[PDB]
Amino acid sequence: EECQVRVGDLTVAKTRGQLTDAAPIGPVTVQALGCNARQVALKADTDNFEQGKFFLISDNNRDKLYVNIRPMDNSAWTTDNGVFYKNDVGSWGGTIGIYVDGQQTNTPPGNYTLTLTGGYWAKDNKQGFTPSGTTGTTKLTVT
């Protein structure tokens, strides 16, 4: 199945200190076409994806802090640092959010760039992921 996922580019001003571990301040409206028997998994792009870890990286790469793209409230997903996929199979179409992992710090920031590549997933941990749909660039400015 070809999972067409709608990932919205979200440029909005927040603090990473306001991110108190479990605080969704980047609710991405993800709509997934199909996926009837498929898991949906998110991946970060080269900007904030190092080998298999995603985080909030600054426009000037001054600070990096790991986050989790976890569903706001609708289901449970298997959290990996490289991919985020539900154990469920089917069209998910809902809202996930950026939660900072354990509230890092928030070191005097400015602009943050976390490009999120949409796609589906077809196995478990072995990285059976396929980039599909739209790549949404979540931009986290502090103001």
From Swiss-Prot:
The keyword Signal is annotated on this UniProt entry: yes
GO cellular component assignments: pilus
Recorded superkingdom: Bacteria
Region Receptor-binding: start-end pairs: 1-38
Compartmental location: Fimbrium
UniProtKB keywords: Fimbrium, Plasmid, Signal
Main subcellular localisation: other
Keyword Signal (UniProt): yes
Function: Hemagglutinins of uropathogenic E.coli mediate adherence to the upper urinary tract. These adhesins bind to the Dr blood group antigen and also agglutinate human erythrocytes in the presence of D-mannose (mannose-resistant hemagglutination (MRHA)).
Similarity field: Belongs to the Dr-adhesin family.
Protein name per UniProt: Afimbrial adhesin AFA-III
Organism: Escherichia coli
Residues of the full protein shown: 38 to 160 of 160
